[PDB]
Amino acid sequence: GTLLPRLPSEPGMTLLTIRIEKIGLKDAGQCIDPYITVSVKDLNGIDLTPVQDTPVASRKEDTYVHFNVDIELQKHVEKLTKGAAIFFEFKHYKPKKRFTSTKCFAFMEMDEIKPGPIVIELYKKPTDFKRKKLQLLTKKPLYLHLHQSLHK
């Protein structure tokens, strides 16, 4: 885990916290030491904030990996450029090849930042930070489950 503390609050500014609940994957339970990397890129796909990594998942299940962890957005909402997008990359350890690979990614755009649950689809690695070319990981209803919290 490389998760950061909530940023210092500001008058009239909003902070966003994103509880990552779970992610569906037809081979969910088979992934070893799985976690997620959360970043925020501009339209050009460049980091607008420091990248964070969630600790390895609490519970796996045949078709679901449970996290139930909170992510603090490292920049106030009304300070993110219009083209920003928040990326979630599912990473796991490949037993034989002995390394960590990014299996898929899900992303949400500025205009999708609102309180309440939100389910995002999953796209095939390699992650496209400009999100211009996408291959759906599975038409199956196995998604990424998040809940968003907007402060002040």
From Swiss-Prot:
**GO BP annotation list:** determination of ventral identity; dorsal/ventral pattern formation; negative regulation of determination of dorsal identity; negative regulation of JNK cascade; negative regulation of protein-containing complex assembly; regulation of protein-containing complex assembly
Q: Does the keyword Nucleus apply?
A: no
Q: Does the keyword Membrane apply?
A: no
Residue span, C2 Aida-type domain: 4-151
State the residue spans of region: Axin-binding.
1-68
Q: Which GO cellular component does the record give, naming just one?
A: cytoplasm
The UniProt keyword set, sorted, is: Coiled coil, Developmental protein
Q: Which domain of life is it from?
A: Eukaryota
**GO molecular function: any one?**
protein domain specific binding
Known function: Acts as a ventralizing factor during embryogenesis. Inhibits axin-mediated JNK activation by binding axin and disrupting axin homodimerization. This in turn antagonizes a Wnt/beta-catenin-independent dorsalization pathway activated by AXIN/JNK-signaling.
Q: Could you say which protein family the record assigns here?
A: Belongs to the AIDA family.
Describe, as the record does, how this protein assembles with itself and its partners: Interacts with AXIN1.
The name on file for this protein is Axin interactor, dorsalization-associated protein
- Please tell me the species this chain comes from: Mus musculus (Mouse)
Gene that this polypeptide is encoded by: Aida
- Whole protein: which stretch is covered? 153 to 304 of 305
